[PDB]
Structure 1
């Protein structure tokens, strides 16, 4: 203004200058410092550059009522309104009033006496808190990539251009030119490319020296009543105080973390209320604070120091995945981290009540690797100190690892260590009589979907350690978990389902900025069922975390039901953002049913939540809606679903809310149970439903999760049967194809008898030479048949990868190349989708196999009794595999034989190899019985023919 400049849109430059940060951020920020300003409206011109909030600063006028005019400008209705922000200045004043010229200046303090109000110190302290201060990987490749690509110019090619002057005519003037606007892009340019580290690696207050002096005047209610407060989001306030961060580095976190540090420092002094409001809130907050630091750090030591926990050694499976997280990179960092980070071992150090910790210690195996690690091992030993309880125990122990989040990817080596017990696996195989525990795999399959989209495929590799597999049997399919929900089934009425849903809400403790449902969690605390929580108040771990935290209730009105009509198509979410279509659901949700406001209680807190999370209950909503709808949605939903039915119909698009769409139908199939109470509740379900599964099946057919689909089909069938009953009553058309599609779903079943229920080499290489002259694998499967390193000449999938790795077994690199295949496998493994059925064995084969093929590498590496032991292993595996589908089995030791085939070949150096190979043929011999067991004619022939060709061309003992 004084140089009057910015009107040039030097602001725009300043705006451009802002391009570091988001809009008018410092404009906000230093408007704090604005108060330095004959500016009375005059600084504010800079708001032209930049008319509300800072009148709090205008309390500096109180430091007067021209503001009231300046208010009255906007309005004076605020006469108290924001004064907290000033009350912070008043805190600052109180600070000046507390413990200097400002201190001298403190006398204005009586100024409030326009107000008597000090009770509003009720809501207080946020800024009283907030007020501290004013009170290499790019270098990887010399090799072909930067040859294929180029490499970054560094040397004098940088300096190459330094010869200049003449043409800068343009240049120098271009600089003079709109570079006068443009050039600061230079000033703006530098910003980029560090991973710094600095976050940890890179005199605010001693309002610290002032810290509690009010609470001193106030009798430590900042402890005490601010304890009695619940301090509740006053905690979460801190998070908000963080939340702003963009560059927190020289920006907030340095203060802001220090704030957390102070918040810790706040949290620090805690004696009673620390748990005794909630450490639970507190800890997971620190956990989040960690999780932030995790997401991120230097003061995370304080976050460590939070392990102070002396009575708070009551820290718990609270502390578990936290600890579990707490590991994760801690050493991998600059050991300055480790310098403390061993505090985990300080954490480790006292066994008392660490049994769970021990029980939970599992990944400390990964903590037992690169450290120390030995201590971790020693801890893991101290963990394992009980008894290497194994077979399922480790498995259970392995099963016991779910306490954490996704990526831990840590200790899984024991999965490899399984084979070391794999006799116990036979012993494990002893388990046959029951319905479970092959899911120990599914536990991997769980891990398989677990963390799936995220980084570090080397996690997905651990399926290799998990790969020894695929004899499992005796069911179709998958399962759910968490009898807590059954413990929740202890609940009764869908307020319970809400109370249950509320768990999912409580199940949001979770992460940034969505914290709003705390108020909803408060809104939860509304009496509605609320004693349902008091009803719930007996058992639960999770509850107290909330019970400590949250906890006279409120209604809402409604008018037009049909006003919700247009959603389902729109909520069909033709475009992306199912969340939007869910926002439309959320709109359908925001469309306010008197079924539950208790639902609507969070609807906004819901609205910004994870859609599906809401959208899940959208079903539960829809059911309440269904429960509500007289004909209303009953009519309305009917087509609305029929829309969702049509939603993908005729090559239209439904996915990933498609299930979510079906999920409604699911909770329709499911949560509808008494809805329109009916003898087939199927009828009732159909009644609760939009009444045609015939589509829903096809919809499910798209959903393609068969059993339900099949059932839903069977329902659609039953619907057709109902329709047939209706046809009776009348007293892919006809859908036997749909039924065949269902048989194809029964094919999608992949249980062969059910499929039957649904039913109710070189010459190949020659044949392939035509192909050689869907393919590579077929070729390489034929290479997996024929002489890989040899018939690799036919390369002029996994099979190929295998054949390649088989070729890569020409040697060495295969060990890596395997990993690639193993990855390619692990990918193929990851390529698993829908997890409902058999052929996970067909999946797990090379998994169950190639690792052996991998394990074979010792042959390329390195008495031969190992080979026997491996044959024995293969045999043991075979025994393990003994009962199986030869169809499944088909490649497997065949591969091994194929593996053996050349394995013996370059091994013809050793005569024992031939004998081993003979024993391997003798191993391969068993195939015949298996082939007989297969009762597969084409199968047995080559073997002896091979055997005849093979070292059983020796043919001495005729066995």
Structure 2
């Protein structure tokens, strides 16, 4: 009962809440199933790999036994917990059953970050198999199955709260790898013959669909099993497959029967083939007829055309009832048809009709147009399957690509429209190679030729493909006449973060659509530190304007929350953040938590919507979720009584999480460090105590110094000066010496004013020398660092002779000077 145990547990767990009478029987069954049978060898592993029971008064007994069983032979570490989560994720179940596992994963994650440091270090050698990418994509899939179900909201909130804990860590990978069953690949490797592989795939799919609730599909599926097992190929499959251990082997045993004569399919041939498939209407569907279109196409393939394989012509009952089976079986149908082709009639016909279909998707109403995305994905899957197979000519992989005469530019454009970015790039490469091949037999030239005949520019297509992929270096590779366009220049500007040039070009160009123009202007102003200018610009934008499009509201709310302008009064991310900060100011914590939960759910749903092909698409949402998580964490600190110690460990957690974010892009790092300083300044504004005000001031000073260092690392000079200005505002220094003054000197050095930094630092050294003889333990480090920096800077700029630099500054630092 090890196989079906998790399904029964996941079914019985929710029903406890509904009513007590059924709850009694459900609880008794679960108790007998778990507590009574813990001392059994067979069920021990299955109980170990089980979803933890919900924390309630009902489940204390079951939870205690499960925890005791799971942690036998030792407790788990951070890594272990993750491996256990994925291992139980191998079992398929409704997303609602995983809520408690999500909560436990969140708690284990927040307890230890220093361990994720070790996992990140360990996964450096092979970034592809790192568990962090696997966990993130696993949570994302668990979210996709959650949509349109009863418990979507609770699941999405937990998933977002988990994803906010990791943040936008640099995964050192480019492409998301969808999960593949290990036993599945081994099973396909087992059968050398092509038809036997089809046997295994079809029988596996039918066995999987045998359990689904609808009775109709089971009625056809059982007949399909009876027919397939009867033929010669089924008998060969069984004799070659019986060696391994698999539950489907036991499931299909009663269905198999021993008969002297194998079932023979009717090999009837129509008087004239190609007649059913000649119609254009068959290949090109309508806008919302995909379900009927795929069934009609598949059955037309089954209608007395080719299909030499004995497996085929037996799948029609299952294809009729279910469409998923139809798009599953279509590529195999086409491969079988083309395998037996003589005089290349099938090849020409299918090539022509596939070209018609693919042109109809790119024509953009029209007589045939706006083809549903599912049909395009089906035909793309057909092309992908056909590419891998080897041709009967025993040629090469490039020849294997051309099973059908395909203009791969159109297919690449369709794949890009369907978000298969890597597939689109590969198809574009294949098309370029083929074009060069036929040219020689008889990128700018190829691009202009493609624009002339096909109407699609090759270089432009590679542009949006590489832009969707998100790899930074590949963007500069694509080039042509399009750099002269202002839009490409602007995007190259913000990619390199030359914000002044982008702002100037945005102001200058007027042909740009208005909304994009103001969005770029606001973004450039925000990244330039011109907060007051941005605020006045937004205020002036109000006059002579209609209702703002949502991006203007989003940017205005971001400016409002970042600038601490609280007077202003579906909800988007920055709107929710602004309302959350206002509620934290107003002690209305209920609305604060509600808005944070709504924002988390919205962000997770938005990530759920998209295709999830490139890891770079994940980073903004990870940053947003981390910001939400830190805000929620500070919420509980502010709600109850606040102590110095709690501030200490929350700030320590902030440095640890930042340490995890060492290699992440500044575009993802800056929002968290903005929210941190905004929250700290709120704590300043409403702390109302002399003792803890100094503690909040010290935390803010350290955070601003760290922000200045981070901005200097990314060669950004505006933000460090703003941070130093804020430090000036909150910390009037009567002593004249402080650690952040050294950072101010470094910032002034970075902005290429050597005299300014040198003057500040010499003044600091003189004040430090006058103040004490370095007996103060706290000031020893600052004094030594100031002396060393002054010596190095004077050596670099050659403003002082070497003797003075050595004797007065560099030797002084050594003389002055537990980790």
Alignment length (residue pairs): 632
Alignment of 1:821-836 (within 5 A): 821-836=599-614
Counterpart of 1:857?
A: 635
CA positional deviation for 1:609: 4.1
Instruction: Indicate the SS of the match to 1:792.
Output: coil
Aligned equivalent of 1:792:
568
TM-fit CA distance, 1:667: 0.9
8 Å CA contact 2:319–2:326 kept in 1: the answer is yes
Match of 1:619 among 324, 328, 331: 331
TM-score after normalising by structure 2: 0.73
In 2, the alpha carbon distance for the partners of 1:675 and 1:808 equals: 70
Match of 1:667 among 367, 370, 385: 385
Q: Per-residue CA shift, 1:762-813, capped at 9, x if unaligned?
A: 322222223456112211221242115x1534x9x31112222232332312
CA-to-aligned-CA distance 1:532-580 (integer Å, 9 cap, x gap): 2321222242322433331012122232431232566434321324221
The alpha carbon displacement at 1:733 in A equals 4.5
1:756 CA drift (Å): 4.4
Alignment of 1:18-417 (within 5 A): 315-317=1-3, 319-342=4-27, 343-349=29-35, 350-351=37-38, 352=40, 353-361=42-50, 363-366=51-54, 368-369=55-56, 371-402=58-89, 403-407=91-95, 408-410=97-99, 411-417=101-107
Shift of 1:908: 5.1
Residues 1:420 and 1:641: Cα distance change in structure 2 (over 3 Å):
same
Q: Is 1:470 aligned to 2:168, yes or no?
A: yes
> Is 1:558 the equivalent of 2:253?
no
Deviation at 1:324, TM superposition (A): 3.5
Structure-2 separation of matches of 1:621 and 1:466: 44
Q: Following the alignment from structure 1 to structure 2, what is the Cα–Cα distance between the partners of residues 666 and 523?
A: 29
Aligned to 2:115: 424
Q: CA offsets, 1:576-610, max 9 Å, x none?
A: 24221111222233334443454434422322343
Counterpart residue number, 2:582: 807
The yes-or-no answer on 1:845 pairing with 2:616 is: no
The answer to whether the 8 Å contact 1:658/1:703 transfers is yes
Partner of residue 192, structure 1: none
**Aligned residue number for residue 142 of structure 2:** 447
Whether contact under 8 Å (1:359, 1:397) holds in the other structure is no
Rounded Cα–Cα distance in structure 1 between residues aligned with 2:138 and 2:243:
31
Deviation string 1:829-863 (CA, Å, 9 cap, x unpaired) is 33443343313011211112211112221233124
TM-score between the two structures when normalised by the length of structure 1: 0.62
Distance of aligned partners of 1:958 and 1:725 in 2 relative to their CA distance in 1, 3 Å threshold? same
Query: How far apart are residue 890 of structure 1 and its match?
Result: 2.1
Equivalence for 1:581: 293
The within-5 A match list for 1:888-927 is 888-907=668-687, 909=689, 911-927=691-707
Q: 1:451 to 1:492 in 2, by over 3 A?
A: farther
Note if contact 1:772-1:779 (Cα within 8 Å) is conserved in structure 2: no
**1:697 equivalenced with 2:412 (yes/no):** yes
Structure-2 change in CA distance of 1:775 and 1:791 (3 Å): farther
- Evaluate the alpha carbon distance shift between residue 894 and residue 782 of structure 1 in structure 2; reply closer, same or farther with a 3 A threshold: same
The separation in 2 between residues aligned to 1:464 and 1:711, in whole angstroms, is 34
- Unaligned segments of structure 2, at least 5 residues: 257-261, 451-455, 480-491, 493-530, 544-550, 741-819
Deviation larger for 618-627 or 694-703: 618-627
SS of the equivalent of 1:826 reads: helix
The CA distance in 2 between the partners of 1:501 and 1:454, in whole Å, is 29
In the alignment, the residues of structure 2 paired with residue 522 and residue 461 of structure 1 have an alpha-carbon distance, to the nearest angstrom, of: 46
Q: Which has the higher contact order (CA 8 A, sep 6+)?
A: 2
Change (3 A) 1:952 1:405: farther
- Give distance in 2, aligned partners of 1:582 and 1:921: 64
Distance 1:799 1:756, change over 3 A: farther
Task: Confirm or deny: 8 A CA contact 2:470 2:616 kept in the other structure.
Answer: yes
CA RMSD of aligned residues (A): 2.5
Distance 1:497 1:660 in 2: 21
Partner of 2:355: 642
Name the CA distance, whole Å, in 2 between partners of 1:581 and 1:505. Answer: 22
Q: How far apart are the structure 2 equivalents of 1:637 and 1:376?
A: 60
- Separation in 2 of the partners of 1:952 and 1:605? 83
Distance 1:753 1:949, change over 3 A: farther
| Other-structure match for 2:205 | 504
Q: Is the 8 A contact 1:320 1:360 kept in 2?
A: no
- Could you tell which deviates more after superposition, 688-697 or 596-605? 596-605
1:400–1:902 distance in 2 versus 1, CA, 3 Å: same
The aligned residue for residue 237 of structure 2 is: 532
What is the alpha-carbon distance in structure 2 between the residues aligned to residue 359 and residue 603 of structure 1?
40
Gaps of 5+ in 1: 1-314
Task: Give CA-to-partner distance per residue, 1:250-300, whole Å, 9 cap, x none.
Answer: xxxxxxxxxxxxxxxxxxxxxxxxxxxxxxxxxxxxxxxxxxxxxxxxxxx
> Does the 8 A contact of 1:849 with 1:892 survive in 2?
yes
**Residue equivalent to 2:738:** 957
SS in 1 for 2:664: coil
1:882-906 Cα shifts (integer Å, max 9, x gaps):
1111122121222222232323322
Contact 1:627 1:675 in 2 (8 A): yes
- 1:878: how far off? 0.3
- Provide the residue aligned with 1:182 in structure 2: none
Q: Distance in 2 between matches of 1:875 and 1:568?
A: 64
Over 3 Å counting, the alpha-carbon distance change for 1:676 and 1:934 in structure 2 is farther
- 2:593–2:632 Cα contact (<8 Å) kept: yes
The 2-side partners of 1:917 and 1:510 are apart by: 63
Whole-Å Cα distance in 2 between the matches of residues 771 and 884 of structure 1? 34
Q: Distance in 1 between matches of 2:380 and 2:273?
A: 23
Question: Radius of gyration: which is bigger?
Answer: 1
Does the 8 Å CA contact 2:298/2:330 hold for their aligned counterparts? yes
| Range that drifts further, 805-814 or 873-882 | 805-814
Tell me the equivalent position of 2:154.
Answer: 458
2:102 touches 2:158 (CA, 8 Å); kept in 1? yes
Q: Is the 8 A contact 1:448 1:830 kept in 2?
A: yes
Are 1:750 and 2:470 counterparts? Answer: yes
Does the CA contact (< 8 Å) of 1:675 and 1:684 recur in 2? no
Structure 1 Cα separation of the partners of residues 43 and 634 of structure 2: 41
In structure 2, what is the Cα distance between the partners aligned to 1:722 and 1:346? 67
Segments of 4+ moved more than 6 angstroms: 952-955
Question: The residue matched to 2:385 in structure 1 has which SS?
Answer: helix
Cα 1:682–1:892 change in 2 (3 A) is: farther
Q: In the aligned structure 1, how far is the partner of 2:448 from the partner of 2:237? A: 49
Superposed CA offset, 1:482-517 (max 9, x none): 012212222222223312232122222232221121
Against the structure 1 CA distance between its residues 624 and 946, is the aligned structure 2 distance closer, same or farther, given a 3 Å change threshold?
farther
Aligned equivalents of 1:633 and 1:337: distance in 2?
61
Q: Which secondary structure state, in structure 2, belongs to the residue aligned with residue 600 of structure 1? A: coil
CA shift for structure 1 position 700: 0.9
Cα deviation, 1:84-128, whole Å, max 9, x if unaligned, reads xxxxxxxxxxxxxxxxxxxxxxxxxxxxxxxxxxxxxxxxxxxxx
Residues 547 and 920 of structure 1, relative CA distance in 2, 3 Å threshold: same
